[PDB]
Amino acid sequence: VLPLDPAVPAPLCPHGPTLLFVKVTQGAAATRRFYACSACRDRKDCNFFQWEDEKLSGARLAAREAHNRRCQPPLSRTQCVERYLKFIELPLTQRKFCQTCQQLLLPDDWGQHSEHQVLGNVSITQLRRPSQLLYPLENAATNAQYLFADRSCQFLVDLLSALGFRRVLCVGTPRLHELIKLTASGDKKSNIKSLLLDIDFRYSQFYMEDSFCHYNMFNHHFFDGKTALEVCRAFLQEDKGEGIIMVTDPPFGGLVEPLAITFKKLIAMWKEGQSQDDSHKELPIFWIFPYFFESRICQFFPSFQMLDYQVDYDNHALYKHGKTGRKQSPVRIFTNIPPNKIILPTEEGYRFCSPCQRYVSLENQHCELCNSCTSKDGRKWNHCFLCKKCVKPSWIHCSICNHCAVPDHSCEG
Ligand SMILES: Nc1ncnc2c1ncn2[C@@H]1O[C@H](CSCC[C@H](N)C(=O)O)[C@@H](O)[C@H]1O
Ligand SMILES: [Zn+2]
Ligand SMILES: [Zn+2]
Ligand SMILES: [Zn+2]
Ligand SMILES: [Zn+2]
Ligand SMILES: [Zn+2]
Secondary structure (H helix, E strand, C coil), X not given: CCCCCCXXXXXXXXXXXXXXXXXXXXXXXXXXXXXXXXXXCCCCCCCCCEECCCCCCHHHHHHHHHHHHHCCCCCCHXXXXXHHHHHCCCCHHHCEEECCCCEEECHHHHHHHCCCCEECCCXXXXXXXXXXXXXXXXXXXXXXXXCECHHHHHHHHHHHHHHCCCEEEEECCHHHHHHHHHHHHCCCCCCCEEEEEECCHHHHHCCCCCCEEEEECCCCEECCCHHHHXXXXXXXXXXXXXXXXXXXXXXXXXXXXXXXXXHHHHHHHHHCCCCCCCCCCCCCEEEEEEHHHHHHHHHHCCCCEECCCCCCECCCCCCCCCCCCCCXXXXXXXXXXXXXXXXXXXXXXXXXECCCCEEEECCCCEECCCCEECCCCCCCCEEECCCCEXXXXXXXXXXXXXXXXXXXXXXXX
């Protein structure tokens, strides 16, 4: 029994309102309510823990509040915008970037970074590609910053163009953001705006207030307040809500329920003020995620189907290309956009499967008994008829269990 009440507000951690966890174990007869950190899995980075009954005293809470104020990024958002306007107006031979600090450098505070490792002659080309200048925060427990491979990212910007979107709400996709901006600015009158939402405050010194928001994705928190929140609200509400799509690449291993709750808050911002009669539209969404999360994702967004495009990364914890060659990427796209409207590059090994009106991989065989090109892995799958589905070729149909699974599994029933 959780008579859990959303009415009352969580305590505040450095990364915005904590989330409530409850443990049920040891016979499922005891409960424990506590507020943990919304966007840090292990306690090693955000060591927040408070029993719900536990109430902070005046002094102890003052300490908590000051600590939260202290853990904030060392530059205000406003300071970032001002430093940027001053930076892009220096000669090339005076644009420096400190790599040990991940900070753009104004000529006056070079001395403080003298004995650091500093990169010189930062061109505007680099400034408009921050994903290639800052090192990626690859820790799986906090950021999981795995950046798209150039080929796949260019595919995504081209797909968003051909579909006919002018605004792209980029929650957790820095590289896609920057490439959208470069395809809108250079050599094309195609207008595409992009609004990066991310917890990586390092991207604040590269985009002005209209293009970036310091944003926590697990609790729907704008670190800079209502001004930033309203930047986001206007970016959704523009053009009566038309011409907008939200692309997300959340950290692959993180809780997946609060993600859906945050995404639904965003959709709620987009649906406000829209015609009551015309309430049959949903906000077009790309949820980029490894394929084995489908069951969970479609449990929260019934209107989502999985495209067969293999999204490739420069770096990832799920696959790194071996000496034999390149291993395949488990990460796919999940959309409410009809997959028959989405055309995959035929020059990458992608063909249109007429039975399941959508594009599929070149090595993907079409299973005629669940009516879809079913081989998600790099191999050829098999169709079990008692489970009425296709399982990976290493799985077997177990007796007594009566459902498909690997040898060396736990038997049930
Ligand atoms: N709690 C959180 N709130 C907002 N953004 C977060 C977050 N946790 C991780 N992120 C961001 O989400 C991104 C996931 S890595 C995916 C990046 C994207 N595929 C690209 O290549 O451009 C990281 O950049 C990280 O900064
Ligand atoms: Zn430095
Ligand atoms: Zn097929
Ligand atoms: Zn099948
Ligand atoms: Zn079976
Ligand atoms: Zn079994």
